[PDB]
Structure formats: structure tokens, C-alpha cells
Design an enzyme around this catalytic site. Structure first.
Site, mmCIF file in Angstrom:
data_model
loop_
_atom_site.group_PDB
_atom_site.id
_atom_site.type_symbol
_atom_site.label_atom_id
_atom_site.label_comp_id
_atom_site.label_asym_id
_atom_site.label_seq_id
_atom_site.Cartn_x
_atom_site.Cartn_y
_atom_site.Cartn_z
ATOM 1 N N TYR A 146 -55.520 -65.168 4.730
ATOM 2 C CA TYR A 146 -56.455 -66.055 4.394
ATOM 3 C C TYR A 146 -57.299 -66.467 5.504
ATOM 4 C CZ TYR A 146 -58.824 -70.393 2.944
ATOM 5 O OH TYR A 146 -59.645 -71.452 2.508
ATOM 6 N N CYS A 147 -56.725 -66.945 6.516
ATOM 7 C CA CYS A 147 -57.231 -67.361 7.827
ATOM 8 C C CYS A 147 -57.860 -66.279 8.347
ATOM 9 C CB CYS A 147 -56.021 -68.007 8.482
ATOM 10 S SG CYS A 147 -56.723 -68.761 10.161
#
Lengths: 221, 217, 214, 224
Positions: A146-147
Site C-alpha cells: 500500500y505504502c
């Protein structure tokens, strides 16, 4: 006010919904994308938004949305890339989920920006705003994929600001999307704080390539 | 004792680093996507050569399966594999996805799946080789730059998850050069950077910029 | 073969680095603010030991003069001199000024006045040792942190001005103000990396055990 | 009803911001170094004009004392006072010290000693006006740039200390030959007016969830 509409992607999300409603209240025509028919989409349609289906999980869905958008309008005041998908790193599904997040966060803004450039330059003042996540400052042990996809999105800010200048300003907002005791200010923000960030960027004339951090001082706490 | 993996080692920088690691007494495994005189040079120098197509998920997982048949431990993984593609009209999505796969999906899956191999080593390192282009962004190479930025994120995040047993760091070379200093760099600057990171006990979550002062010029 | 200058090197980290450089075979000049057993250790090890008071312009220019009597070339200058002072009520301005003098004024004046010494060497480096505190700031150590941030700016600006003949880089170690050793050795290895590199200028190496991801 | 302090308000940016704030209905206190038509203008518009010499500790502390005789509260302090000096041979140390005093020592002591005035106000802001040159450094303006970088550090540090009651943020603006070159180096190819900085200030003052940040106001010079 421009008569050219503002596109906000993924506007059934809390932050996106608030921003879209406030833009409508301000007097902008607004187009939204949505991926699931929901009460929030009904709220947006009732408030005056044009609701276009947009599945940004794969290239074909992104291109189908682009085709739909171009039928709808020949000019855009702004594109606000708000669509976001957070997925668990479920064992056996990590690659699938990382690819889906790449598609939503990186592929879709890139393709939309590339294909929508002529719509934006048909407007006298034109903006792209990428909504990322303040998690990119530090990284995330838990939410690696995600990051990384949100970090890719923040890179697009710098690169499209360069390519699309001088006619289109390109900026980001990085909210602490999670959002209490871990921030400095220690208060619970409303989505209004993101709308005020968006208004600052849209109304500016001399700001491009920048990213606004909206995180209650989490980084100084 | 355990080998060091360097991916995409037929590339100029990767070839030099692998050869230098061999010269310094390490056991080395390389991945390659194209049979080439540089791959023969590496086999002759002592490297084990594994095919690896990181352009897609199935190629990445096939490579992981192969690696695990080759060794039960790793001293380090150096993510050197890189693909720069043009933004050819009509191929932009395909090219972006391919660079995503090479620069982001591959390091992430290899890192996740190979963590037990690294933890079988007393000292263990992951090094991500990105590109200094990420500093400024690129008007021309938007997709490329973004995929390299995602890789740099993986450094922070894996440094956090894999603490304290695996150190995770980056090198960001001005891969266009392969500037304020106005010399032509050899790949040796990248190898020196790799040695510093491998030899440190302490350093994790950092990225070394190797760009001849481009950012101050 | 031109000497390397390391400032403020009765500090544990500077002491370690000076001794390691001497073992490595370099000629080394050190500055010291007060006479102390480790200064005789340094002398014994081969160091050219010079008094340096970085409290004020006068003390800094005295040191530069003294340095220039010793040598007409330098291989490198390592700005290691560091002073931490409490924000004691009623002494905050005096302490902020003193930290400015040691961390910013001294490196600035030394670099400016010693550029000809450095350009007389075929390979030349300046290394600024700051403190990893600058990344996040410090609620407690505001003045100290601001002066270290000022020093980090000098890396970028001197890198630009002194290119191509002098490489200018930083090392930003964690907990430098808490030092009373792996830490000193990692600093030494970072220094060696910078000195031996050919294509690195304008950078700052973070040495902090991954504190920023933790 | 608590006043906003803008330091160095004779300067072009500070003058504009002070006038706009007065126009917006805030009470405004300014500092000035020298009498100037711009000080007369500010007085005529309703600013409280206070003398302040930020070249040394004595002058800074004298200004703080004077401020304390004028008001028991502050809505905000905007550290706009700025001094650019040339690196004149034989005056380098003097000039670096002077810029340290104006850009770092002054905001530090003002913030430290005026925190109680700020916390008398329900919403309180400190805003540090630095300069976009800090991002890249400056071959020419080394000392100036370093003092501006120190100022930007004060944002992070006072944001931590003074939370939750006072928000602390920065604006980093791209403050003839030099202009012509800088413009060409911007992405947007516009010469900015001080209104760009006023809009940044309004954003920071009016925000509720922003502290420890610095706004880059530079026409995309960093991406060009």
C-alpha cells in the site's frame, strides 16, 4: 467560477464524498467516478454530480472510464485523484493485491492524466491534485505494498508538474488517512481539512509540484 | 558463507558488482533474462546463473522457486534488475506495468519469500538499487521514475519489518550517467556503496545517492 | 599524503576517527578546545595537535592562522567539533550563539579560508558531522537542532561552490549529543566511504540504527 | 480580537500581508527597523507599529518587552523579518552572525518568550517565513541560506514543543539578473506578487489540523 467540471475519482469514499459535496456547494460542476452503487452515490447524484462508473483495478477498466469521461465533457477545470484502495497483505494474495493497488493508485492517475491533458488545457486555469497518504514519509512495516503504491503516486506529482507546466498545475495532498494520541494536535479532523487543502491548491496561481501534509503534526509527535 | 544474490547482473552495473563480489571471495548467484557473453563471463568467474523474468508475477514466482532449490541461505539480496522503457504511444500501460513488475513487484515478493533464507545468515542485507531520477521527478520518464520511487519506499518499509535481523538499504545512482563533479563514473562507485552497506552492522532504512552532485548543479 | 584535519577531536567520535586515520597511514591534524590525556594519546599516535577555540570569530580566525602555519595543503577537513548546551533560562541566547559559532560559523570560515589548501590536493574532501536529530526536530533541544540543520545546509552550498575540485558531504549520526564503540566505528566507516568515493558530493549519510523506521 | 504580529513589515511581502490582514478585519502589530513611507502607510491602515532591532540579543529582548507592554495576547506571530547581506570580504563573519540574529535568534527568543501571549488566544499560530533557496542550497548565498535552513528547523522543533495549543508552520517562498534567471528556472513562468504569500498565510491561520509543515511557494522551480 469555471463552467468546466471538476472530476473527483472514487467519491463514495468519506473524504472524496465531502470534497465533492463542498465543490458542488461552491458552484463547480462536478463529475465523480464510483465503483459500487451506494447511498453515497445517490447522495452525490441528488447534489448535482455526474456519476460515471470507474473500475480502476485494471488497465481495461481505466480505459473504459476514460472513454466514458470523454463522451461526457470536452474540458476539465481539474482532476482530483482521490480513488484509493487499501488491501490486507493476505497470504497467497500479496501479488494480486499489490497489482490492484498499483492499478488504482499509480496506473489510473497516470493514464487519466495523459489522456485528459487536452481536456484540462481547454480550461484557462487547470489543476491536477493527487491524494496520497502521509504514511509515505516513514514507510509502513505492516502496509508495505500500500505504502509503496502511494509513494509512486507522489512521484507522479513531481513528474506531471514538470511535463504539464505551464498550463496545468500539479500538486498533492497527503492526509493521515488512518484518521488520535499519536498526532501532536490530538484532535479528530473532519474531511473539511482536506477540502480546505484542495481549495488552496485550486485557487493558487504560483504553486506546482508540491504536496500538502495534513496529519496533525504526527511527524513531530 | 552464504551466497549473495544480485538480480539482473547482465546489466553493466550489476555485472561489475557481481564480478567484484566474486573477486572479494563471496559466493554469488545472479539472475539473467538474456543469455549473453556477460552471463558466460559470470559463470566462468564462479557465479551460479539462474534465469529470471521479472516482467510478470508468474516469472517472479518461478524464479523464487528456482532460487530456493539452489540455496537454503542468503548473505544478501541486491535488487539490481532494472528496465527502462519508452512511453510509446499505445503501449504506456503495458510498459508501466512491466516496470512495476521489475522494480516493485519483484523486490517485494523476493523479499517476502526469501526472508527465511536471509535469517539463516548471521549478517543479512537487502539492497535496493533505484535511480537518483526520483529526487526531482522526470518530465520524460514519468512511469519509470514512479516505479523507482515505489522501490525506494520498499526500503523504508522492509527495513522496519525485517529489523533487527536483516538490514535493508538503497543505492540511488544517476543511472543516466552509466553533474557537479564532471567526471564519467565507473560502476565501481556503486560497488563501493554496496560494500559500505554490506559491511555496516548498524545502518538500515537509508539510501545512498551516487549522482556526482547533480542536485547541487 | 596531504594531511587530514579533524576538528574537536578529543570528543570520543573525533578521537576514534583520528586514531583510525593515523593507523590507516594518513597524516592527521587535530584541533582541541582543552588539553586532556587523549590529546597526548593523539600526539603519541602521530597527530599534529593544535589548539582551536571555536567560540567566536576571533578564536576561529586564530585557529585558521595557526593551521596555515602548519601546512600549505589538506587532503580533507572533517568538521567534527560539536557542543551541546542546555537551554538554561536566562542563558538561551548566549548558548544558541555559542552553538551557532561551533556548528555553523567555524565550518563556514574554515571552508572559505582553507579552500586553497584543499585545492592543492589532487583529491579533496570536506565532511560535516551534524546529528540525525535534524530530520525530526527536537522539542527539547531546539537551538542545538537548528544549528545542526544550518550545518547541513552548508554541505549543499559548499558542494555547489567548491565543485569540481572539492567534494563536500555530511554524516548525521544519531545521539551524538548523548555520547558519554559501534557508533564511533560506523562514523569512521562512513568517513572512509566518503573520502574514498569519486562521484559523491552534496550528500548526507544517515547513521542512526534505523531509528527513523522504528 | 487578539492581534497578529508580523515582524519586518516594511519589507514588500510583510507590508502586503499586514495590509491584507487589516483589510480582513484583524488587529495587526508590526515591527520595523527604520521609519519609511511603508510604516506610515501601515499606521494609517491601523497597524500598531513597534520598533524592533533584531541584530542582537539586546534588541530582540527589548522588542519582546515592548510587545508585552502593548498586548496581553497574540492570535499569531508571523516571522517575516529577513536580512540578506553580501558575503563581503572581511565582513563574512559579521554578516553571518547578523543573519543568524534576524533569522534564527529572533524567532527563537520571540517564540520562547511570547508563547504565553499566544496561548491566551483560543487558536494560535506561529508562521516562519523562510526562503525556497534552502531546498537546493546556494553557491552564492551560503550564509544566508544556512540561516534560513536553521529557521526551517525551528518549525519542526517548536511544532513539537508548543503542541497542542499553538500550531507552528512555515512558508518557503522563492524570495534583476537574479530575477530573470530565476523566472526562466520556474515551471509556471509567472512572476509572483506578495498575494501568493498572503494566501499561504490564510491557509495556515485558518487550518485546524496542520502543524510542523512548510508550504513551498516557488512556481515549480524544483521540477523544471
Amino acid at each position: 467560477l469555471s463552467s468546466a467540471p471538476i472530476l473527483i475519482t472514487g467519491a463514495s469514499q468519506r473524504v472524496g464524498l465531502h470534497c465533492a459535496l463542498r465543490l458542488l456547494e461552491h458552484g463547480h460542476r462536478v463529475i465523480i467516478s464510483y465503483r459500487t452503487e451506494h447511498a453515497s452515490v445517490t447522495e452525490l447524484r441528488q447534489a448535482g454530480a455526474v456519476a460515471l462508473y470507474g473500475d480502476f483495478s485494471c488497465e481495461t477498466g481505466i480505459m473504459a472510464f476514460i472513454d466514458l469521461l470523454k463522451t461526457q465533457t470536452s474540458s476539465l477545470r481539474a482532476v482530483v485523484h482521490n480513488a484509493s484502495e487499501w488491501l490486507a497483505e493476505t497470504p497467497g494474495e500479496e501479488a494480486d493485491n499489490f497489482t490492484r493497488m498499483f492499478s488504482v493508485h499509480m496506473l489510473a492517475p497516470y493514464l487519466i492524466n495523459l489522456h485528459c491533458e487536452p481536456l484540462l488545457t481547454a480550461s484557462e486555469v487547470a489543476d491536477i491534485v493527487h491524494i496520497s497518504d502521509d504514511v509515505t514519509r516513514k514507510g509502513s512495516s505492516k502496509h508495505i505494498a500500500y505504502c509503496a503504491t502511494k509513494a509512486g503516486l507522489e512521484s507522479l506529482t513531481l513528474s506531471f508538474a514538470a511535463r504539464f507546466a505551464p498550463l496545468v498545475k500539479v500538486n498533492g495532498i497527503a492526509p493521515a488517512l488512518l484518521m488520535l494520541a499519536k498526532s501532536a494536535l490530538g484532535i479528530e479532523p473532519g474531511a473539511e481539512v482536506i477540502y480546505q487543502s484542495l481549495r488552496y491548491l485550486l485557487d493558487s496561481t504560483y504553486v506546482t509540484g508540491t504536496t500538502l501534509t495534513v496529519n496533525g503534526g504526527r511527524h513531530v509527535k
